[PDB]
Amino acid sequence: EVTQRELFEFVLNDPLLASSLYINIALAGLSILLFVFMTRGLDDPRAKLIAVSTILVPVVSIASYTGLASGLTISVLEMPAGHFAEGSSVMLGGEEVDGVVTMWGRYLTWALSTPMILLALGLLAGSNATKLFTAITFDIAMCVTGLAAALTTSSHLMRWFWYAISCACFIVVLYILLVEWAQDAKAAGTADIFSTLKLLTVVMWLGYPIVWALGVEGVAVLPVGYTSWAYSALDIVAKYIFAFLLLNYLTSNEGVVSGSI
Amino acid sequence: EVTQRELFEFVLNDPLLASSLYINIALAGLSILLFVFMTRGLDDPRAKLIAVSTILVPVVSIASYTGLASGLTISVLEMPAGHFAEGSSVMLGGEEVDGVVTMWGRYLTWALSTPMILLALGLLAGSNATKLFTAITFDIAMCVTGLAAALTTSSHLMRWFWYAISCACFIVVLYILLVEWAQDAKAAGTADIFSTLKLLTVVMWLGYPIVWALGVEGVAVLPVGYTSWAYSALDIVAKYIFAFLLLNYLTSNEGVVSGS
Amino acid sequence: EVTQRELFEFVLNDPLLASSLYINIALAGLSILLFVFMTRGLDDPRAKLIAVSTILVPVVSIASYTGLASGLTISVLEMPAGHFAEGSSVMLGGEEVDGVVTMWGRYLTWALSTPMILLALGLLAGSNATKLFTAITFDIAMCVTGLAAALTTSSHLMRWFWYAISCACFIVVLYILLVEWAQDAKAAGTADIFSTLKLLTVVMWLGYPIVWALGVEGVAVLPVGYTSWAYSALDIVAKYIFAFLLLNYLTSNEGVVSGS
Ligand SMILES: CCCCCCCCCO[C@@H]1O[C@H](CO)[C@@H](O)[C@H](O)[C@H]1O
Ligand SMILES: CCCCCCCCCO[C@@H]1O[C@H](CO)[C@@H](O)[C@H](O)[C@H]1O
Ligand SMILES: CCCCCCCCCO[C@@H]1O[C@H](CO)[C@@H](O)[C@H](O)[C@H]1O
Ligand SMILES: CCCCCCCCCO[C@@H]1O[C@H](CO)[C@@H](O)[C@H](O)[C@H]1O
Ligand SMILES: *C/C=C(C)/C=C/C=C(C)/C=C/C1=C(C)CCCC1(C)C
Numbered sequence A: 001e002v003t004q005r006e007l008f009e010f011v012l013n014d015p016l017l018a019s020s021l022y023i024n025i026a027l028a029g030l031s032i033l034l035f036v037f038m039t040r041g042l043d044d045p046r047a048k049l050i051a052v053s054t055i056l057v058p059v060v061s062i063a064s065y066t067g068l069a070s071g072l073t074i075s076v077l078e079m080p081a082g083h084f085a086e087g088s089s090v091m092l093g094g095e096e097v098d099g100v101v102t103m104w105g106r107y108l109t110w111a112l113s114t115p116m117i118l119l120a121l122g123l124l125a126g127s128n129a130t131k132l133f134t135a136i137t138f139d140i141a142m143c144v145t146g147l148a149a150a151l152t153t154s155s156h157l158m159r160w161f162w163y164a165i166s167c168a169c170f171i172v173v174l175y176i177l178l179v180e181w182a183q184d185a186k187a188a189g190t191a192d193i194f195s196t197l198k199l200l201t202v203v204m205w206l207g208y209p210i211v212w213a214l215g216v217e218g219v220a221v222l223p224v225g226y227t228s229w230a231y232s233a234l235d236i237v238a239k240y241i242f243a244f245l246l247l248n249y250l251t252s253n254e255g256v257v258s259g260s261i
Numbered sequence B, C: 001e002v003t004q005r006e007l008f009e010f011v012l013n014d015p016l017l018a019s020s021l022y023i024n025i026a027l028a029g030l031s032i033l034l035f036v037f038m039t040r041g042l043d044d045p046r047a048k049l050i051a052v053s054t055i056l057v058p059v060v061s062i063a064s065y066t067g068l069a070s071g072l073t074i075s076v077l078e079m080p081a082g083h084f085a086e087g088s089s090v091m092l093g094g095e096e097v098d099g100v101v102t103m104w105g106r107y108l109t110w111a112l113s114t115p116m117i118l119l120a121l122g123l124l125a126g127s128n129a130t131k132l133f134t135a136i137t138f139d140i141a142m143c144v145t146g147l148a149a150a151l152t153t154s155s156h157l158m159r160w161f162w163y164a165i166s167c168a169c170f171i172v173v174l175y176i177l178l179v180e181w182a183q184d185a186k187a188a189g190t191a192d193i194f195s196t197l198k199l200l201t202v203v204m205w206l207g208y209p210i211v212w213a214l215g216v217e218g219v220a221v222l223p224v225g226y227t228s229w230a231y232s233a234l235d236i237v238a239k240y241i242f243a244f245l246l247l248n249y250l251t252s253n254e255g256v257v258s259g260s
């Protein structure tokens, strides 16, 4: 019964929710412009690959956040028995609707952007194709099983089982970042910048499953609006500032990563 | 709740709609047969890569069009206030239903076929991996944001914002075709044939956002039936004749494109 | 009206259906741990690429089967006129509901796992990029048109048309497996292991379109519960035992697949 328009209007009229969404559409757009400008002098094909992969992060982000803001990738789901958000109401259109406003579109943002973050980092670290393939495939599995968890309403236990599977995939990604590429970067001559970006990425990425657990999808100590801002704040650092820092290094060290595709 | 059968029946009984879909299903099938025949002499792995990528175009087209013809990838959507198609109704089953018959399945056709056209062109021009990656990623973003625009019913302005984002992605693809690959093709020794396929692709591709703006998705000067035929006509040229021209060149110049 | 919980409960409380799903979740899970353990000694990057691609098979399987078991990837569809399952009922929850419980989630299991099976096999056979690309693309087309067939309710004949398209794509994959990779494997020095894996794959894969035609999706001689177990039994072989065999060889011939 809930229409896209009703959800679009619910987001508007809800200061927290509206701001957490529209601020990122704005920051993503500005980031694209800034990043394109910064990388204008790049000529080496390998350097340009790192640049495009990084720039695709805010491109995916602006489109995906528009998906949420428009109401296209938002749904109202009723949580299963025992879920801390069970029996919640939302007030849409004009009546009280059972369920929780679920911004599942965020998982699309993650599924399409995290592979680009990983591609950029792997290339920076001088990774071989095997580790890149492993990091990217498990990263995608992580995001998709996370979406499945959020979309599951049949059983409370099932939701957390998906969450556990997602975490396991996340561990694969963390192992590659912390152990494999950490060492590869030394041979690539990007040890300093990779270690910094590696640590920044690990710290911020760890925040997502924590927010999931604490937010409306998990134990719900954080209401819908606050869960959204938690994710948007993480996104601002894990995507935009992260990309700005990587591009800052790249544009001053093209020769170091020049090599060959 | 409109059924898949009701939309399938709607396509039928509606001349322009039925013809625009089934004629492309038929042409796609015939194209695949012809292309397979045309390329049985190929032996070079690189020449064969270009050939398979090209043949995948009509393969995606026949499956995707069947998705539309069957009603599977069609939905009825109610446009937002201010949209020229808002207030429209359609006869489905035994009742009048509010909304517009939306052939969103066409976006699946484009999202799966355009990357193959780009891959064939890039390989032909001797493009490096970075440019191929750039062209294909932005091409997919263009098709997906285009689909998002067609699926947005909450706000008229939002629909056009998606449209703008999609256009920006399109500009990236255009730049690579017109500037980068045009130059790369000279080193690959395929400057002439690339020039022909490039001109064809750029002109035809530019037609899609125009049809979008004029059709039911946009200001609706073109009814659902004319919108479909407009897109179908473009597909015939951008897909089938494009593929023929490329394959006709490939089968006579296998030596030129042969490589790593 | 049918909720996710109702389909979730339908699977549970139905010994046949529940066993066919939850058993594969367990086998997939145990397989991942077993394979990771078995390959812990690999050092060569090419060998590791084959191992990870193979390991992703049970990874996709455990996630996909959970999608089915949870009810997330299951729907209730009413078959079209003429379909042998037309006018069927099921009793979702405690009410008699028209249609057939359709576990379309299986197609996601296939579309995501088969490419990994093919990439592993192709690499083992020392396939060039062209054949890998050809096999994988037509394999995905096969899975997606198969899904389209299962999801089509507008026409009985349309379902079989999709089926035909999917079969045509399957033939392409079979040709690469049986003719081309069989030859490549010789030059790669993996002829004997490939022969074993090739036979197992061709035989098991042939079973799916057979189960489709015989099950509720096709002529419906096999009820929903038996159709599920038929696919599950095939999965156990085409995925888990196939993976064990490939990995057992891989870890014993790391040097051969490395090259230099
Ligand atoms: C910066 C991103 C650009 C997207 C801008 C989308 C916001 C458009 C909001 O429009 C307004 O919405 C109200 C509630 O639906 C209507 O009552 C009103 O008549 C309409 O004018
Ligand atoms: C690392 C994460 C830890 C996972 C924690 C998951 C525990 C939630 C279990 O759900 C509960 O299970 C009961 C028995 O099945 C149901 O009766 C009840 O209604 C349901 O709400
Ligand atoms: C990493 C985060 C850990 C997740 C912890 C989630 C545990 C959920 C506990 O909920 C409770 O479970 C009981 C059954 O055990 C129900 O009877 C009760 O009604 C329900 O409210
Ligand atoms: C390997 C992990 C797989 C997860 C399996 C989840 C099983 C949890 C079943 O819970 C029960 O489901 C019934 C029907 O919905 C409820 O009536 C009952 O109250 C609830 O306790
Ligand atoms: C731009 C977005 C970024 C960098 C997103 C990162 C997301 C994750 C690391 C998400 C991880 C999750 C789990 C490990 C468990 C289940 C839920 C998720 C999806 C939040």
Ligand SMILES: *C/C=C(C)/C=C/C=C(C)/C=C/C1=C(C)CCCC1(C)C
Pocket (backbone or CB within 6 Å): B109, B110, B113, B114, B142, B143, B145, B146, B147, B149, B162, B163, B166, B167, B170, B205, B206, B208, B209, B212, B235, B238, B239
């Ligand atoms: C076989 C199909 C082809 C070649 C399709 C091409 C499609 C495009 C070039 C579409 C472009 C669009 C925009 C630039 C703006 C928004 C709407 C679209 C999706 C029609």
Ligand SMILES: *C/C=C(C)/C=C/C=C(C)/C=C/C1=C(C)CCCC1(C)C
Pocket (backbone or CB within 6 Å): C109, C110, C113, C114, C117, C142, C143, C145, C146, C147, C149, C162, C163, C164, C166, C167, C170, C205, C206, C208, C209, C212, C235, C238, C239
């Ligand atoms: C792990 C799953 C595997 C190996 C699945 C293999 C599936 C196929 C070979 C399916 C083939 C089909 C056809 C050829 C015709 C139409 C229906 C299908 C999808 C069942």
